[PDB]
Short mmCIF file of C-alpha atoms and ligand atoms in Angstrom, two decimals:
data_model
loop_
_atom_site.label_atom_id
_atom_site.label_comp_id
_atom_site.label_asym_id
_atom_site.label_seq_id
_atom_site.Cartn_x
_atom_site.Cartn_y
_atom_site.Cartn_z
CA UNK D 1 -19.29 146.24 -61.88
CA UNK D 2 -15.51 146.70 -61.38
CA UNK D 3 -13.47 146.27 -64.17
CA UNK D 4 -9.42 145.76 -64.13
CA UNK D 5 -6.83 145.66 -66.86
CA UNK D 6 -3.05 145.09 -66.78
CA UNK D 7 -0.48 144.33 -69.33
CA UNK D 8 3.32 143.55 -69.37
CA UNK D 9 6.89 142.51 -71.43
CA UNK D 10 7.11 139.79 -69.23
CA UNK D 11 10.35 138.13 -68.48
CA UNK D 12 11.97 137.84 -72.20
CA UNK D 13 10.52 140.26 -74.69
CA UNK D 14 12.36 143.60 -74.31
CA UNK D 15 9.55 145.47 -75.94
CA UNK D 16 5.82 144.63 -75.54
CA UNK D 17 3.35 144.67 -78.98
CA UNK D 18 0.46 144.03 -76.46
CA UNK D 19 -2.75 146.15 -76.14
CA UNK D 20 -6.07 146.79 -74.20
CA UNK D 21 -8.28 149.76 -73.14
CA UNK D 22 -11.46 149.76 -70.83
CA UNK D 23 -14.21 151.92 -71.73
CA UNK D 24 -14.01 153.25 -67.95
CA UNK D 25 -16.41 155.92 -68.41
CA UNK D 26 -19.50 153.46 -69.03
CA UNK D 27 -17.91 150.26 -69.23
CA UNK D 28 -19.69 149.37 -72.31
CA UNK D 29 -16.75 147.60 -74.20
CA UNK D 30 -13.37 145.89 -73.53
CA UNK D 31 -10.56 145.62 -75.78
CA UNK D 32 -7.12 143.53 -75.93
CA UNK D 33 -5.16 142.68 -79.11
CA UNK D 34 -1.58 140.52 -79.28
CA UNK D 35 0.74 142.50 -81.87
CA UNK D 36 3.32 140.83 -83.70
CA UNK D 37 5.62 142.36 -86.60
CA UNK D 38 9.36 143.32 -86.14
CA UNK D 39 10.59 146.86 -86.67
CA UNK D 40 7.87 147.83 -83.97
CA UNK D 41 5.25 146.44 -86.03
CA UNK D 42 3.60 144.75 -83.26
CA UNK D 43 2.96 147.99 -81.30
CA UNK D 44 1.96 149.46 -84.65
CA UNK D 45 -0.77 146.69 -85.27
CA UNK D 46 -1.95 146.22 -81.98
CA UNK D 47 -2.09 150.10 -81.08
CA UNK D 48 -4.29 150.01 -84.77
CA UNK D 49 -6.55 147.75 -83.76
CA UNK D 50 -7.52 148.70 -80.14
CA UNK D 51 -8.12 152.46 -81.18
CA UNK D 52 -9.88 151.74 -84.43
CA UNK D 53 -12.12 149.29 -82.83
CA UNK D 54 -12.50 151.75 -79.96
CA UNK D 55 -13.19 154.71 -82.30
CA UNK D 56 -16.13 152.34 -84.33
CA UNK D 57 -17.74 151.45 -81.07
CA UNK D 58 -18.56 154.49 -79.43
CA UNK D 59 -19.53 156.23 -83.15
CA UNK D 60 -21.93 153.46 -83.60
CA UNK D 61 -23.17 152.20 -80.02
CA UNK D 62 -26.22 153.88 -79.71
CA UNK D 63 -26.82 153.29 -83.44
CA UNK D 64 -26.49 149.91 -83.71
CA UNK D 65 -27.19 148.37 -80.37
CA UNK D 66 -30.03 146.46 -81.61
CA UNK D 67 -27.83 144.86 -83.86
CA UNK D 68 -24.46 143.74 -82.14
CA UNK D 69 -23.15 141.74 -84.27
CA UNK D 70 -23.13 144.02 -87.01
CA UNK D 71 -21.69 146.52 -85.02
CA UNK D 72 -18.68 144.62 -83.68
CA UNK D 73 -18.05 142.84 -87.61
CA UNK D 74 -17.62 146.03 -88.62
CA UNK D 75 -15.59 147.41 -86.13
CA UNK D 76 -12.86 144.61 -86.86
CA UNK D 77 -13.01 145.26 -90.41
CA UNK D 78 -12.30 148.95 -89.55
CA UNK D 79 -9.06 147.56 -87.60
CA UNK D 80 -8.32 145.53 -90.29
CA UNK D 81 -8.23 147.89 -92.78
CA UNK D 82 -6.58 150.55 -90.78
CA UNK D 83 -3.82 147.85 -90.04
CA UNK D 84 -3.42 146.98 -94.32
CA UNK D 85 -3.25 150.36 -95.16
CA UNK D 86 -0.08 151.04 -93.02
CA UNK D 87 1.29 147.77 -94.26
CA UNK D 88 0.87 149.28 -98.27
CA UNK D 89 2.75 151.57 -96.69
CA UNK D 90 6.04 151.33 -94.49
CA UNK D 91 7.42 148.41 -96.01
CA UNK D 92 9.36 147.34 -92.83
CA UNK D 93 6.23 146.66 -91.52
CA UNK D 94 4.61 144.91 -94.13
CA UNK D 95 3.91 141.56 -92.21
CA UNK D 96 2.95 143.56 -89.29
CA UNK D 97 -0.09 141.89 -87.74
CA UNK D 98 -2.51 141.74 -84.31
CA UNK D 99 -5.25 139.41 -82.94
CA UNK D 100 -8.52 140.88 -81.09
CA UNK D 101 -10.77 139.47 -78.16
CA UNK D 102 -13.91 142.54 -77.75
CA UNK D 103 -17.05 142.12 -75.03
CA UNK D 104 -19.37 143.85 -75.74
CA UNK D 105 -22.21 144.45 -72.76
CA UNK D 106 -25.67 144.75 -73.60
CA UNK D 107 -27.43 147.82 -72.17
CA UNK D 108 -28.97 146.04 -69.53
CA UNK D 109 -25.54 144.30 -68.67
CA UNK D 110 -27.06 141.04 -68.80
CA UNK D 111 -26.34 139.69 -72.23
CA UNK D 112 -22.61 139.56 -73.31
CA UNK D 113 -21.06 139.53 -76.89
CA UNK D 114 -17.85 138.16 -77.63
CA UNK D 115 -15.90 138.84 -80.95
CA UNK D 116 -12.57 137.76 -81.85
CA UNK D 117 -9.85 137.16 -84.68
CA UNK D 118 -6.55 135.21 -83.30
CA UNK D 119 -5.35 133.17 -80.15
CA UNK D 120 -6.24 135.84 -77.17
CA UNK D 121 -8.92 134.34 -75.35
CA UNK D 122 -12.04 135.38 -73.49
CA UNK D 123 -13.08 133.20 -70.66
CA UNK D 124 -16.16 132.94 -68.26
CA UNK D 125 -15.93 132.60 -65.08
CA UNK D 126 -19.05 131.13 -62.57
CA UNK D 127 -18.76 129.76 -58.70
CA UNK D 128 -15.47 128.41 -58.89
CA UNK D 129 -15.72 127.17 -62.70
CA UNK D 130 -13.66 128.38 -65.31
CA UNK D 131 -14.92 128.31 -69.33
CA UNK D 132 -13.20 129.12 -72.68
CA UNK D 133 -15.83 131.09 -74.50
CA UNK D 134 -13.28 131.91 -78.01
CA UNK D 135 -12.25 129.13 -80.07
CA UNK D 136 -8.36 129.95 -81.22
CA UNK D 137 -7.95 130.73 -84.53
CA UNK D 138 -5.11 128.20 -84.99
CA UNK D 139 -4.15 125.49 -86.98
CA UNK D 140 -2.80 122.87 -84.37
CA UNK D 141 -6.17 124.29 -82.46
CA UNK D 142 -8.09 123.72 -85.90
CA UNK D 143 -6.54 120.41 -85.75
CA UNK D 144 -8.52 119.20 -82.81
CA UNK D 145 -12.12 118.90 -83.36
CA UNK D 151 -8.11 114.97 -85.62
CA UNK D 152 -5.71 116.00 -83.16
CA UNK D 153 -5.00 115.13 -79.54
CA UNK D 154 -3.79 117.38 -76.55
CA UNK D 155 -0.49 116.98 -77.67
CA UNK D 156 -0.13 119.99 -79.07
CA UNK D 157 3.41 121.37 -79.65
CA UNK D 158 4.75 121.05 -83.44
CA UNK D 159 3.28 124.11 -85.43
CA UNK D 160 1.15 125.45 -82.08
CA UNK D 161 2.18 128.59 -82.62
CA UNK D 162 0.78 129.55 -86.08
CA UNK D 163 -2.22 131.98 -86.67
CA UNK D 164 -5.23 131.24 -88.96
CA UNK D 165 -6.39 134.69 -88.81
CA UNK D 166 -5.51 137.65 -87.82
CA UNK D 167 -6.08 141.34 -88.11
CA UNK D 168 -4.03 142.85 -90.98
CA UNK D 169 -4.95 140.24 -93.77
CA UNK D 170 -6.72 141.38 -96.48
CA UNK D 171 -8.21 138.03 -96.80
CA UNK D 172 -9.41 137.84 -93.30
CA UNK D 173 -12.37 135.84 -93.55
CA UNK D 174 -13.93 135.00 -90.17
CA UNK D 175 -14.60 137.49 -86.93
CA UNK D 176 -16.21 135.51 -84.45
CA UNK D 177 -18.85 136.86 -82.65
CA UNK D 178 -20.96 135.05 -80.36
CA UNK D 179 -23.17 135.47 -77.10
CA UNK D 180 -22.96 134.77 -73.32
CA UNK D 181 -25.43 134.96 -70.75
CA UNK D 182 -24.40 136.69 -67.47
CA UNK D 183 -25.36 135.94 -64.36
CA UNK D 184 -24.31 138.28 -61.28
CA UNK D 185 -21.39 137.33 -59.31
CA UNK D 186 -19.78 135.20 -62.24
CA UNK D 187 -15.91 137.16 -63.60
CA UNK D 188 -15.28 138.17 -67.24
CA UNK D 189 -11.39 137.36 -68.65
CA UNK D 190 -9.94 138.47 -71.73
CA UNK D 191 -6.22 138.11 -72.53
CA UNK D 192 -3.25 137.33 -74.98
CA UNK D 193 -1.94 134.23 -75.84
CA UNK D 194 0.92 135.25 -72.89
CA UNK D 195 -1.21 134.27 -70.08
CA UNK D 196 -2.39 130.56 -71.24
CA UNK D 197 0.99 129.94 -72.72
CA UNK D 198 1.91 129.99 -68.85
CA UNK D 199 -1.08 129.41 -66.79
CA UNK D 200 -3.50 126.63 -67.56
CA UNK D 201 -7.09 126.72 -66.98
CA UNK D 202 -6.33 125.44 -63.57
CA UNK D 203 -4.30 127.99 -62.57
CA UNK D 204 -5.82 130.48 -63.90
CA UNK D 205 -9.72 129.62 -62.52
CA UNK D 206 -8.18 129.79 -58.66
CA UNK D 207 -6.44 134.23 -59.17
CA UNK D 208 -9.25 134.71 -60.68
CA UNK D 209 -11.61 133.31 -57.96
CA UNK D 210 -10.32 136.50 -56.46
CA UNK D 211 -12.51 138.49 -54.97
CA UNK D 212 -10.82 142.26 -55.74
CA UNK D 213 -9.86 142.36 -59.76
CA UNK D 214 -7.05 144.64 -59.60
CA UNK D 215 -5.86 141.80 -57.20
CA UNK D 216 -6.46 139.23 -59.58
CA UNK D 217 -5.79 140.65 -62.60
CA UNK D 218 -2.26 141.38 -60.88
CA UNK D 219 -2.17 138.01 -59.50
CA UNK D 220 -2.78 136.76 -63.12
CA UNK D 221 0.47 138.32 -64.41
CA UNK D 222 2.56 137.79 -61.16
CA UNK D 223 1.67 134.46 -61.95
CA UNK D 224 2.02 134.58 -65.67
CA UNK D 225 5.31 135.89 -65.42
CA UNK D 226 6.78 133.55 -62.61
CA UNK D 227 5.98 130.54 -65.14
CA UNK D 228 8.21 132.16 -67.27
CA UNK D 229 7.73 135.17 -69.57
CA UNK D 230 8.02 134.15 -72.40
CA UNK D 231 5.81 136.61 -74.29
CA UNK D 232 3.79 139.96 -73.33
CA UNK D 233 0.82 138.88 -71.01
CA UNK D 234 -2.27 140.96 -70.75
CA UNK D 235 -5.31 140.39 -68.91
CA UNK D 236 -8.46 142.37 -68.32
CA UNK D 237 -10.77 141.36 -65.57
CA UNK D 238 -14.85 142.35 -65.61
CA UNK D 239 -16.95 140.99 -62.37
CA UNK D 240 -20.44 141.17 -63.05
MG1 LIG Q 1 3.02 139.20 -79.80
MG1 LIG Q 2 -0.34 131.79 -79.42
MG1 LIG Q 3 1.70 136.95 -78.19
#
């Protein structure tokens, strides 16, 4: 399968506390994580979470296969540790935080698993249909489901989130795939733009580096308001 990722500052931000890496080599795993924290403690947490979810991943793969969800709960909790212990630390950082949106591709790339803590999404993609697979981890989001589409008071507020040493729920969850359907994960900077709409017809795309580049050509023409990063799987 060909597999695309892309990030950016967009139009505002000056510096960019997003984060993603492919597992290229195999193409096992994806990873993308939305930092936030001032004093660079975005970069800090996000940079945390992507390499010590990366690191627990390919220690454990062949170990733990059989059980997923296992493997990717403790993976996050990994992150999340890693990110609380530098927060203990440099006190400039200490509200220094990151969300997390992992697929994980069964063996016979057929299955899908799809873990997450925050607002960065993963969607699924299947002749010319776009689905939300994550549920936000957000209290106007947590609203709905009491709550109408008229979300814009609090919308903005987290629920979870890497870097909490209460964090208490990683969402994991699988997807069937079926050849030919796409594979989106990205940070709250994309949707904040792009709706559904939108973002169903770049992604329709047939070449993912063209899409996923469409995505944040888009993205940022909308406005740029924050750091928009997309990674793009076709089955
Ligand atoms: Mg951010
Ligand atoms: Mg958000
Ligand atoms: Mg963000």
């Amino acid at each position: 399968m060909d597999v695309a990722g892309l990030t950016d500052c967009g139009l505002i931000r000056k510096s960019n506390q997003d984060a993603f890496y492919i597992d290229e080599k195999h193409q096992r795993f994806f990873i993308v994580a939305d930092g936030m924290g001032g004093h660079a403690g975005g970069e800090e947490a996000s940079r945390l979470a992507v390499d010590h979810i990366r690191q627990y991943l390919e220690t454990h793969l062949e170990d733990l296969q059989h059980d997923p969800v296992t493997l990717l709960r403790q993976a996050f909790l990994a992150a999340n540790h890693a990110i609380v212990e530098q927060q203990r630390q440099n006190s400039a950082r200490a509200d220094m935080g990151t969300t997390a949106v992992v697929i994980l591709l069964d063996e016979k790339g057929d299955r899908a698993w799809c873990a997450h803590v925050g607002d960065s999404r993963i969607y699924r993609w299947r002749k010319d249909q776009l689905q939300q697979i994550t549920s936000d981890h957000t209290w106007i989001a947590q609203a709905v489901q009491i709550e109408q589409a008229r979300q814009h008071p609090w919308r903005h507020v987290l629920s979870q989130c890497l870097g909490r040493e209460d964090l208490s729920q990683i969402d994991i969850q699988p997807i069937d795939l079926e050849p030919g359907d796409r594979l989106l994960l990205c940070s709250d900077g994309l949707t904040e733009e792009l709706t559904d709409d939108v973002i169903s017809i770049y992604l329709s795309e047939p070449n993912v580096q063209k899409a996923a580049a469409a995505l944040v050509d888009a993205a940022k023409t909308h406005g740029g308001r924050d750091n928009v990063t997309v990674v793009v799987i076709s089955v």
